[PDB]
Structure formats: structure tokens, C-alpha cells
Amino acid sequence: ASNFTQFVLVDNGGTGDVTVAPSNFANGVAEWISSNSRSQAYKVTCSVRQSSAQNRKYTIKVEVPKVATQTVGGVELPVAAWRSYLNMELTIPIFATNSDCELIVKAMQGLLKDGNPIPSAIAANSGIY
Amino acid sequence: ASNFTQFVLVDNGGTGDVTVAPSNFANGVAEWISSNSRSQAYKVTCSVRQSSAQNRKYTIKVEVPKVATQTVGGVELPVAAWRSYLNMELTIPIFATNSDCELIVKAMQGLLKDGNPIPSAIAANSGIY
Amino acid sequence: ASNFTQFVLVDNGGTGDVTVAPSNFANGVAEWISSNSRSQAYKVTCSVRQSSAQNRKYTIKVEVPKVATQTVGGVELPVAAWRSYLNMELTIPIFATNSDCELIVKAMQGLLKDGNPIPSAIAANSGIY
Amino acid sequence: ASNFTQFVLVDNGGTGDVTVAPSNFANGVAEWISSNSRSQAYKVTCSVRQSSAQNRKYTIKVEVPKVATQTVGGVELPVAAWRSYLNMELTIPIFATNSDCELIVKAMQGLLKDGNPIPSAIAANSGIY
Amino acid sequence: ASNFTQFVLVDNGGTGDVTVAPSNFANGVAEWISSNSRSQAYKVTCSVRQSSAQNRKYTIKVEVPKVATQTVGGVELPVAAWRSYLNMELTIPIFATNSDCELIVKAMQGLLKDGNPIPSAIAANSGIY
Amino acid sequence: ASNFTQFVLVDNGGTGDVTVAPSNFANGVAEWISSNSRSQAYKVTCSVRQSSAQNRKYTIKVEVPKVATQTVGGVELPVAAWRSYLNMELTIPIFATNSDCELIVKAMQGLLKDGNPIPSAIAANSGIY
Numbered sequence: 001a002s003n004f005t006q007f008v009l010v011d012n013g014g015t016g017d018v019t020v021a022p023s024n025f026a027n028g029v030a031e032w033i034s035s036n037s038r039s040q041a042y043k044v045t046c047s048v049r050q051s052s053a054q055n056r057k058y059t060i061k062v063e064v065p066k067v068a069t070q071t072v073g074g075v076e077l078p079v080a081a082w083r084s085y086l087n088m089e090l091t092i093p094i095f096a097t098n099s100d101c102e103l104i105v106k107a108m109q110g111l112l113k114d115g116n117p118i119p120s121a122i123a124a125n126s127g128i129y
Numbered sequence: 130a131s132n133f134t135q136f137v138l139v140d141n142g143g144t145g146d147v148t149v150a151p152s153n154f155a156n157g158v159a160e161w162i163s164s165n166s167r168s169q170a171y172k173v174t175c176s177v178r179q180s181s182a183q184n185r186k187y188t189i190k191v192e193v194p195k196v197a198t199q200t201v202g203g204v205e206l207p208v209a210a211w212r213s214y215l216n217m218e219l220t221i222p223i224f225a226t227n228s229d230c231e232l233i234v235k236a237m238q239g240l241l242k243d244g245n246p247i248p249s250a251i252a253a254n255s256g257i258y
Numbered sequence: 259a260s261n262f263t264q265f266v267l268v269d270n271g272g273t274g275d276v277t278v279a280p281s282n283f284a285n286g287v288a289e290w291i292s293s294n295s296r297s298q299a300y301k302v303t304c305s306v307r308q309s310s311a312q313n314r315k316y317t318i319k320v321e322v323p324k325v326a327t328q329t330v331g332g333v334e335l336p337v338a339a340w341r342s343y344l345n346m347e348l349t350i351p352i353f354a355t356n357s358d359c360e361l362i363v364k365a366m367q368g369l370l371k372d373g374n375p376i377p378s379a380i381a382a383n384s385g386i387y
Numbered sequence: 388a389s390n391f392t393q394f395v396l397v398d399n400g401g402t403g404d405v406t407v408a409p410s411n412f413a414n415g416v417a418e419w420i421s422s423n424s425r426s427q428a429y430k431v432t433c434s435v436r437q438s439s440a441q442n443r444k445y446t447i448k449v450e451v452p453k454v455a456t457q458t459v460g461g462v463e464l465p466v467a468a469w470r471s472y473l474n475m476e477l478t479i480p481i482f483a484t485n486s487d488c489e490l491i492v493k494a495m496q497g498l499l500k501d502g503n504p505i506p507s508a509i510a511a512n513s514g515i516y
Numbered sequence: 517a518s519n520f521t522q523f524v525l526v527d528n529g530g531t532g533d534v535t536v537a538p539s540n541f542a543n544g545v546a547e548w549i550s551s552n553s554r555s556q557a558y559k560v561t562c563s564v565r566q567s568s569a570q571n572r573k574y575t576i577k578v579e580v581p582k583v584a585t586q587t588v589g590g591v592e593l594p595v596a597a598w599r600s601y602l603n604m605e606l607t608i609p610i611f612a613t614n615s616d617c618e619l620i621v622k623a624m625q626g627l628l629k630d631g632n633p634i635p636s637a638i639a640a641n642s643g644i645y
Numbered sequence: 646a647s648n649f650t651q652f653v654l655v656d657n658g659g660t661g662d663v664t665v666a667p668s669n670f671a672n673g674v675a676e677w678i679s680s681n682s683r684s685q686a687y688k689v690t691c692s693v694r695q696s697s698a699q700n701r702k703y704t705i706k707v708e709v710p711k712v713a714t715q716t717v718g719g720v721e722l723p724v725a726a727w728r729s730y731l732n733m734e735l736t737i738p739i740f741a742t743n744s745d746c747e748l749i750v751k752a753m754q755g756l757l758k759d760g761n762p763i764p765s766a767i768a769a770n771s772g773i774y
Contacts (some may be wrong), residue, residue, distance in 0.1 A: 001266060001279065003246040003257040003774070006224075009239040010232060013155040014722055018236070022517065024772030027561065028262075028283030028542030030246070030257035032774070035714075038572065039610040042236060048249050048256045048280050056296060058251060062240060064233045068226040073713035075611040075726040079569070081183060081222050085234050088217040090251065091152075093195075094296040095211060095335050098254055100195065104213050105248045106139045107147070107193050109241045111173065116136040118175055118189055119234045120196070122219065125227055128133045128159035197333040205371050254293050257264055258278035259521050259536045261504040262515045263437055267497040268490060271394050276494070286542030288504075288515035297388075302498065304505050306514040312469075314493055314512075314554065318505055323443055326484070340482060341442075342491050346459050346475035348509065352554040353469060354453070354592050359505065361397060362471050363510045364453050365405070367499045368396040369431065369473075370492070372633070375390040376447055377415075381492045382485055383443075385435040386391045386417035460596040468591045512554050514540035516520060516547075520773045523761040526751045534752070548772035554759050562763055564709035564772040571756075571771040572727060576763055580752050582738075582745065598740060598747050601758075604733040606767065609726050613713040614770055619655060621757070621764045622711045623663070623687060626654040627707060628754045630714065633675070634691050635750045638703060639733065641743055643693045644648040 004030050009042055020044055037073060039066045039082075062086040063122050133159055138171055138191075149173055166207050169196045184220050191215040262288055266298055267320075275305040278302050295336045298325045312347050391417055396429055396449075407431050422466045427454045442478050449473040520546055525578075536560055553594050556583045571607050578602040581626055649675050654687055667688055682718060684727075685710045700736050707731040 008020035009032075024031035034042040043063040062116040063118075066082045073112070076082045081090055092104060112119050122124055133154070139147035152156040153160040163171040172192045181191055194209035221230065241248050250257050262283060268276035278290035278300055286307070292300040299322040323338035350362065370377045376377035379386060389393035391412060397405035415436070421429040430450040438444035452467035479491065480486055499506045508515060518539070526534035536558055540547040550558040559579045567573040581596035608617065628635050638645050652736045654677075657661035665687055669676035672692075673719040679687040684771055688708040711727045725733070737749060757764050 001138065001258075002147065003250050003251070003255065003619045005246060007245040010233075010235045011239055022774050023770070024200070024564065025148065025541070026546075027285075028256065028280075028288075028771055031774070032246075032771065035614065037611055037616070040769075044247075046250070046257055047282070047284075048250070048691040049284060050296070058247075060247060061239070063235050064238060066222055066225050067231050067232060068196050068229050071714060072684075073611075073613045073616075075609075075711070075714070079175050079610075080181075081224050084221045084229075085227065086217065086219045086233070086237060090215070091214040092251075093211040093213060095195070095337075096213065096254075096296075097294050097336065098252060100213075101254055102252045103252075104137060104215075105192055105241065106141075107171070108215060109238070109243075109248070110136070110138040110140055110147075111189070111191060112241065113136075113237045114234075114238075115175065117132045117134055117754070118173075118187075119177070119238070121132050121177075122187060123227060123231045123234045124222075124254065125225070125230055126132070127593075128154070128175055129131055177368070199331045199333050201331065205332065208333070210335065251330040253279075254296060254299070255279045258260075258264070260516060261513070261540075263504065263506055266505045267458065267498075269497060270493060270494045272488070276497075283515065283541070286514075288542075300494070302505075302513055306508070306540070316505075316509060317466070318498070320494055322487075322494050324480075324487060340480040340481045342417075342483065342487075344475065344477050344491075345493060346473065348473050350469065350471045350509075350512075350641060351453075351469040353595075354471065354512070355553040355594070356551055358451075358453060358471075358553075359510045359512055361399070361440065361475075363506045364397045364399060364498070365429070365449055365451050366473060367496070367501070367506070368405075368456055369447070370496045371395075372496070374394045375392065375485060376431075376445075377492045377496070379433070379435070380445060380479075381420075381488045383479075383483070383488055384390070385415075386412065386433055387468065431546065455591050457589040466591065511537075511551075512539065512549065512557075514542050514547075516538050516540035518763045518774055519769075519771070520763055523755070523758075525755040526748060526757055529686060533757075541773070543698050549664065549680075551772075555689055558752070560763075562766070568725075574763075574767060575754070578752055578756060580749050582740070585721050598738040600745075600750075601736045602753060603702070603736070604673065604731065606731045608728065608729045608767075609711060610705065610728065611726050612711050612770070614768060616711050617770055618768045619712060620731070621649065621759075621768045622655045623658075623707060623709050624731060625757045625759075625764070626652070626656055627689065627705070628750065630754075632652040633677075634689075634705060635646050636646070636704075637691070637745060637752070638688060638692070638737075639747045639750050640646065641741075641746055642646065642648065643746075644691055645646075 006032070009034070009044065023087040036065070039070070039076065039079065040070065048063075051091065055093055058088075058092070060086075060088040060090070098129055131184045138163070138173065147171055165196075169194055169207050169209050179223075179225070180220065183223050185223065187219040189215075193222070198214070265290070267292070267302065276300055279287050297337050299334070309349060312353075314352065316346075316350075317347045318344075318348070324382040335374050394419070396421070406490065418426055426464070426466050427452050441480050441482075443481065445475075445477040445479075447473075447475045447477070455461060522548070525550070525560065534558055552583075556581055556594050556596050558573070566610075567607065570610050572610065574606040576602075576604045576607070651677070654679070654689065663687055680708070684724065685715065685717070695739075696736065702733055702736070703733075703735040703737070705731075705733040724742065 006021040020032040023033040135150035136165040137148040149161040197210035263278040281291040326339035393408040410420040455468035522537035524535040536548040584597035586595040655699040665677040668678040
């Protein structure tokens, strides 16, 4: 293997895709960034450690630019009005086999499949109702 | 429309699909659990709060159980041998359009798509390298 | 260029080979872990530090698990029944050129070469005689 | 039958080979030393002891000299300009069968096999990267 | 792509080129050293940290040794008679585009181009006048 | 000699070059500035002093304008969002001959040659990986 490669983060179907590429590995934290200024980039980081004697935790973070009315390459302040931050922590018991970890991945991607309630609440700027 | 519906969390291709259904909304936390005893159930919860004045924060959690049957006092009880915990917080600026929010949802599902680096690492009990 | 990669810790033929893959490099400690349950995994770590003004000191550690299943109360968990622990410290003065380091490496692999006294004493639960 | 014998610590070709020959086995410590001046000699020792009720612990040590001549007051002495010191401790539970010991030995020699990350970091005055 | 590769630090036109190669990344500091003993090696290190909220700061260091062979205790050791130290810190706003960053790199190499004032002064043990 | 002249700081190959010209020499600190307002100028300064009894230090500073979305001659605030700052300190032992200083200059320009890792990390808005 060799996991640390470029991948498509936003698939707008071929044209307008956002690819994110390896950009830092200081401290064994893999970072991927898109081709933009660091203030407007899509950024992804991932690391894993044994959190307790019984568990490992993957910590995954994503930053996504507010794009409507963006000025590309512009200085946009305040930073917080222009960025969304995702923070995932996955705690997996040391007993989990690879098959177990496959299922955890499937649960994670089921949660976010189109049409399911959580992605469609987020995208519609809504809560659950 | 009411987006509080049942959905399939783990798609094992029609056979042994784990599907999760609305089960509680007390205290503004939407909860979905699978059709098991509460001791062995998959659980998904979601809540949105306006965290800052200019942010909203979604908090989503998933529990994946490893089911087992334990003998306690000479009696067999349905139990989960361990659970894995996904815990994610998403902070979105209030200035984000629905098209901006769709970008976040697309980035989150691209992150976990089959074959991209992070799902591969998790599924292999590996780190990124 | 990278030497933090996957490698074969045990060529046990060309099939039952044990491979260890990069897992974490926090705080200057490179760690590699084999796949499947962390509870039954082989682990290797390595770190180098300037122990004195004139010396650098590598600390390398390897753990070899005896794979087993713990069954308690009817619940079975994949565990390591026990682990052997190798721990080695190699001190090298800053005056060593690369050729001197190659020789140190050849001494290390000669020490453990198949058929020589130390590897064959260990392999047979035995001391020197 | 004896494993306290001479052996090749460095096959540096088939000519500049460094051989270590039995020197002393006092107090359960087997010692081997290469020929010519003890001051420039390679040294290997090995001892095994029941560290705990359940464990035996091997302690192996190797010293690699940098050969040199000290000249003081016109008197020259064959000396070691400096020495690298390898020191390793291997703990094995009394439950290990001979096959488990063979595997422990294969893990040790895989760790140091030519081309793998640890031997090639050492060989190049380098850490992991 | 992995930009952590070997490069030639001092180009003496093919003959006596000093070339430096990846040697450590512990603690997020990429290190390159030349192929000498650690006592006589050229060393280059580089690290990036997000210094402010709106800045990132690169810290690059270079050590150029003047090699020598010293007699200590009647024994000759490979040594550096002195080292010269380049130490540079670059602070870049997060709003800088990759085209903005290319401008910085072009300015830094124009600064040291052969024949411009600063390289000439350094090379002549002169100040600017 | 007479080092203090105009030179090309950014060579965009004839057309679009940035020339920086002598602009101040108060306190023996040579300053060069481009033809712009002081808030948008490329600025270079250089000075040398004996830092210790054994060393001299050249202190070189460069300021580079953020140019993407720049308004030429405009008032752009905050200043820190619109400027990058380079700071180099070169410490050279008083024993270094001119030949030694030539080599230090070559090491400095090798570090920054196109294609080598440090300039290409900077230009790609990246760390080392």
C-alpha cells in the first residue's frame, strides 16, 4: 500500500472536480490541500494513535471554503465567515478485525449517502423535522 | 417532507443491510436505532445548535456494536462485546448558501468514498503513509 | 524518498509473511503495526536521538504476539495470549562515517544469521553450552 | 554438541571477515572476542536468565571498534579510537514452544534484513523519514 | 511526488558537488545531511508552522562545515574546524496564492544570483558600499 | 568594487522584471526598494557586523508584496495580510577565507535552485512530505 496520494474530494462529475493533494506530513499527520491559497483551500488531515489501552482513534479534519461570492485569491476577512470546519473522531476497539473496520467504513458512508436525512438536512441548511 | 426518516446505514447489498429508524427526539436530539434490543443496537444521533452568533454546529454520532451473547449468572443475555464510536462536529458559518452547504456534503462523501486514502487506511487497520 | 514504509518482518515462506505497515510517527517515534486486530498485531518502533555530545543512540523495539482467542462468559475476543519483547539500543559516536555504519549493520546481521550461536540458542529455548 | 564456538560476525566478503572466537564463560556469561589486540577487538556476550516466573530473558551485547593507533610521547599503541555498542534484551514467556522461538528469530532477522527501513537508516547515519 | 528528496547543495560543476539527502523527519523537522560522518556533514533542516492565525512561517537552516582532522589523545578524529550557519525565517500570509508564493521564491533566488550585490559582498568578505 | 547598485530581484525574463534600486544607507544599512509605494514595494536590506569575537553576521531582510488582487497604489489593510517577510542571518567564522565565503554562497543558492525541495514546497504552499 501507500495511502498518501491525491484524490478527488468534491466530484462535480469530471468538470469542476476538486482534487486535494499531499502537502505535509510533519509528525506523521497526513495533510492534503487543494490548489489555492491556504485561506481558501479545501484542506484534509488525518492521524491515528492508540488513545487508550483498549482503543485507537482516527482524528480526521476537513476545512471547506465558503464559495458563494468568493474573490479568488482575495483577502477575505473575517476568516470565520468564510470557512466550515469538520472534525471527526473515530474510536475503534483494539479487537476490531479488518472486516469489522470495513463495516465501520460502510456505516460511515451510509450515514452520508445522498438522500439520507443527515446529508440532506445539512445541505438544506436545516435541522431534523 | 419531514427529513426524520429511516435509512440504511450499512448496505450489505440487499442481504443483511443494517437499517436504522427514527426512535426519539427528546431534548432536540434526533435519534435513530436499528431494530435490535437497545443493548445490541446501532445508534445514530444528530443535533444542530447556533453555537456562536455567526455559526451553527451540527453534532452527529454513530455507535457500531460488535454483538455477542454473554452468560451472566448462568443466564444468557444479548450484549455488545464492544462498540465503535464515530463522533463528528461540523461548524458552518451563517453566511453559507445552500450551494455552499452542498459543497460540504460533497466533500464529506468524497472523503469516505471507496478507494480514497482515509477509508482504505481505516479498513486495513493502517495509518496513512 | 521515505524509509517510513511497509516492510516484511517475517518471510515465512512467501505466503504466511508478516508485514508491518507505518502507523504513527508522533514525537520522533516511528511505529509500524501489522494488519487486523491491533490486539494480535506485531509492533516495531524506532527512534534516534543524540544521547550525548558525541553519540547518537537508536532505540528499536519489536513485539511478537502469540495469537489466541479469549473466551470469557461466552464472549470471544481475539487476543494475544502473550508477547515476546525485543528491545535494542545501538549507540554510535558522531565520528562514524557511513562505511563504519555499514559495518555496524553487518555485525548486527552476522550476529543473528541463521546457524550462528545466538539465533540458534534462542530458536531452541536454550542458552550457550 | 556445543554452540559456544567461533563464528563470523561480519562477512565482509570472504576475506576481510570478522570472526569472533570463545573467550570466557564465567558466571553464565558467554563471551567471544576477535583475534589480535584485545584493545582493538570485537566483543559479543550473551546470557539467559529466568527474569520472572513466566519469563526467560536473553541479554546479548556487541561492541564494534574503530581501529586506530594512539601515539603519545612517541610511543604508539594499537587502540580502538571509539566503539559502537549494541545492547539487546529479548524476553520470552515459558509457554513458547520451539516453533514460536523460530518465529521470534525470523522477526529479528527480518527487522535487520538488508534494504528494510531500520538497517538502512542506521547504515546511512539517519532516522526515519 | 513527495518533495522530500535529495538535492545538490553545492554545485562544483559535476566534480565535488556537495549533495545532501533526506535523513530525518522526527518532530516534523525535515533534515537532509551530506554523506559524511555526522561530525563533518553539511546539514539542512526545514519546518513550517502556522505561527499566527493568519501566517505560516517556514524556518530553514543550513550548516556549512570546514572539515579537519584533529588529534585528540594521540588519536586522529574526523572533525569540523568550524561551521558557518545560515538561518532563515520566512513568514507568509495565509491569503497568498501559489502565484504569490512563486514571487517570493523568485525574489529569494534573484537576491543571491551571481553578480548581484549581496552574494558579491559575502564572497569578498566585504560589506555593501 | 562598489556593491550598492540596482539589480533585478524578480526575473520574469525581460518583461515584467522587478528591479530594486538603492534607496537608503542610514547607519551603513544598505536598502534597496522597488518603484512603488512603501506599502507595496519589494524591499531588500543588508548589513554586516562582527557578532562575536569569533564570528561575523550578515543580516539580510526581504519584504515581498502579496500581488494577487492587489490594487496598485491603494490603501490595503491589514498590512500583514498583504506582505511576506524574509529574514536571513548568515554567521561566518572569522577564519573563513574568500574561497570559503564563495562556497557558502553556492550552498545558499543551491538550497533555492528551482526544482530543489525547499523552493518547491514554498511555491506550492506546502510543507515537506
